[PDB]
Design a protein around this ligand. Structure first.
Ligand SMILES: [K+]
Ligand SMILES: [K+]
Length: 666
């Protein structure tokens, strides 16, 4: 009813070019008011895209994007109000050769004072011109060679391992990845990671100079982290032995779908993780029984293949008794927005959207009185509630501008009087926006970001340092001048995937290290706990194996099943006996509304929460390419993928976080 006369329109010029995107925004509270939102696209004399303007900024004579191309329409130079200015160029072979980023302006001209220049080097003739190295140089500083590739030859030794023509040695920002063996099916059977020595010091940086691997191997720490894989005839992975010797095993059905999975801890016997897994005709998971006897049943809508039911239960005849642990029921609008959710065990979440399918209202429950939402998790409710009066109902309202910037989250919890409003202050010349506690003046928002559009201050006392590639380097949590600061640093591989996280807090010093490897998280705590987290699935089931510092209250090699919702948010942790360990509910944009557990000690070992992503101690969710602020409803930096999902480079899953999920950030 709210959607009458709200189509999507594309307006063309006389040469088949889309010069206008027209939407029609209508709020359910004011159904007589329809805002015509117009996005403008201007094309040049050569028929290529030159300018793009959102409905908001166009009114203020500011251009979201400007492009300058070659004679074929390939973009060379870009001006972004969100991502700053950039310059790229590819060669005649189509390969990237240069990318200059983090450029601003002011005085009129472009400010190159902090420009980052990444260049790509390839094998020269008579070689096939394979990738040779990647060089990275910040303005005024020396160039570092951040990547180097080494390829195997034609020797019988190399052929027997199927390595001929393969990049056998990859030197990245973290150190070295060696490919030891390749399957007959072209799949890696053995890879080994070596870390650069002293990655604990944030000032030590990779720099692979020259063409001698002997001189480089000396810069690597001694430990070798080898992941071994065994694949089937169709190239699918069957077994995996991680760097510490644990094995994951899978088996597929007659249709080649994952049908069972097992785990064999080092020195242990094989045990069932997933016993049986059935699928719908559309290949969606239907019934999934785990080793804890717990059964998840997925119910789908016949006409649409939409997931309308998620039922996790201890079935009849279970050793711990029959019980429905979770029974999520989804009701959708004809377009597929989640209108409502129910859980059987009365509780109900209701949702209202605008004609653009932006979430404008959300009802739910929280443990009241929690207090005003921030970067922190609520204190866990221990033990598990027996009564539901412990929860109170809340209603949140969401307010967006013409460019999709979430400006306001109005939290209303009347009964416990837990009422507050989270305001986001948006720039008047960009999509850059921060919480009002940082500034309430639109004119001061842009200074709080880099030229690339990466946020420099998380909260009031907390600053953000970034890598030249735009990766998050350091979160300064408690600054103490000189020179003992509560902080958390990060390291990434050549693919910009996180490999290392180091948290430091003053007490000599509490240091928490997290090493991310295939199917494995190696977490140490000093100031000593040595924890190895086996990640099973792709991550669904997690196993906690202590080599040292196992706390009382938790048995070693503890298996934790995770049970999610529609958008993959970890809601229930359940042990090997099928007993609920923790339960967690989320505000639509990620904040934790409910956090409960059967013990205080088991709470500290859940890291993955919203959208199946890890929440770091900083409060940020790490998605892969970008960090997410669940309290501000937006990304911490501009989309590195650019305009693939609209002009707004900060907008979070198109402002519909109940239907949509983001896999990486990018
Ligand atoms: K519509
Ligand atoms: K061979």
């Amino acid at each position: 009813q709210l959607f009458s006369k709200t189509p999507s329109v594309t307006v063309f010029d006389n040469r088949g070019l889309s010069v206008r995107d027209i939407a029609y925004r209508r709020h359910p509270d004011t159904p007589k008011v329809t805002e015509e939102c117009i996005t403008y696209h201007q094309f040049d004399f050569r028929g290529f895209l030159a300018q793009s303007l959102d409905p908001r900024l166009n009114h203020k004579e500011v251009t979201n994007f400007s492009y300058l191309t070659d004679l074929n329409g390939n973009i060379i130079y870009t001006q972004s109000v969100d991502a700053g200015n950039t310059l790229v160029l590819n060669d005649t072979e189509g390969r990237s050769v240069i990318a200059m980023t983090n450029i601003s302006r002011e005085n009129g001209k472009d400010d190159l004072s902090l420009a980052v220049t990444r260049t790509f080097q390839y094998e020269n003739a008579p070689l096939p011109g394979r990738p040779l190295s990647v060089t990275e140089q910040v303005n005024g500083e020396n160039a570092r060679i951040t990547e180097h590739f080494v390829y195997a030859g034609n020797t019988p030794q190399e052929k027997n391992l199927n390595l001929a023509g393969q990049c056998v040695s990859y030197y990245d920002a973290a150190g070295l990845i060696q490919t030891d063996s390749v399957s007959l099916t072209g799949k890696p059977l053995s890879v080994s990671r070596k870390l650069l020595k002293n990655l604990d010091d944030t000032n030590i940086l990779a720099d692979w100079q020259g063409n001698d691997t002997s001189a480089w191997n000396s810069l690597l720490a001694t430990e070798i982290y080898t992941t071994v894989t065994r694949t089937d005839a169709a190239g699918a992975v069957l077994t995996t032995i991680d760097a510490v010797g644990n094995q994951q095993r899978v088996a597929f059905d007659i249709a080649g779908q994952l049908s069972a999975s097992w785990l064999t801890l080092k020195g242990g016997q094989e045990q069932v993780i997933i016993k049986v897994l059935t699928y719908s005709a559309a290949g969606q998971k239907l019934r999934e029984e785990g080793g804890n006897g717990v059964v998840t049943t997925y119910t789908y809508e016949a006409e649409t293949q939409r997931l309308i039911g998620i039922k996790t239960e201890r079935p009849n005849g279970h050793a711990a008794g029959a019980k429905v642990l979770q029974d999520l029921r989804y009701e959708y609008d004809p377009v597929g927005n989640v209108l409502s959710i129910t859980n059987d065990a009365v509780p109900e979440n209701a949702y209202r959207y605008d004609s653009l399918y932006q979430l404008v209202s959300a009802s739910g429950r929280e443990v009241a009185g929690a207090g005003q939402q921030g970067s922190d998790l609520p204190s866990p409710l221990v033990p598990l509630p027996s009564d539901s009066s412990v929860y109170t109902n809340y209603t949140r309202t969401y307010t967006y501008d013409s460019a999709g910037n979430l400006m306001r989250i109005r939290h209303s919890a009347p009964a416990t009087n837990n009422n507050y409003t989270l305001n986001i202050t948006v720039s008047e010349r960009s999509n850059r926006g921060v919480m009002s506690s940082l500034t309430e003046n639109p004119a001061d928002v842009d200074a709080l970001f880099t030229a690339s559009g990466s946020q420099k201050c998380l909260q009031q006392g907390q600053s953000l340092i970034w890598t030249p590639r735009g990766e998050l380097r350091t979160v300064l949590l408690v600054a103490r001048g000189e020179t003992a600061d509560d902080s958390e640093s990060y390291r990434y591989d050549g693919s910009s995937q996180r490999i290392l996280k180091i948290s430091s807090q003053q007490t000599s010093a509490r240091v928490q290290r997290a090493l991310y490897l295939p199917g494995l998280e190696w977490r140490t705590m000093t100031g000593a706990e040595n924890l190895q987290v086996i990640c099973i699935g792709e991550a669904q089931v997690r196993v906690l194996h202590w080599e040292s510092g196992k706390p009382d209250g938790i048995i070693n090699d503890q298996i934790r099943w995770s049970y999610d919702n529609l958008t993959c948010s970890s809601g229930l942790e359940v042990d090997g006996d099928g007993l609920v360990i923790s339960m967690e509910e989320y505000y639509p944009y990620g904040g934790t509304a409910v956090w409960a557990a059967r013990s205080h000690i088991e709470t500290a070992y859940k890291t993955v929460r919203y959208s199946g992503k890890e929440r770091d101690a900083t409060g940020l969710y790490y998605y892969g390419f970008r960090y997410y602020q669940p309290w501000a409803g937006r990304w911490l930096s501009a989309d590195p993928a650019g305009t693939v999902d609209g002009l707004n480079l900060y907008r979070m899953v198109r402002n519909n976080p109940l239907r949509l999920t983001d896999p990486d950030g990018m």
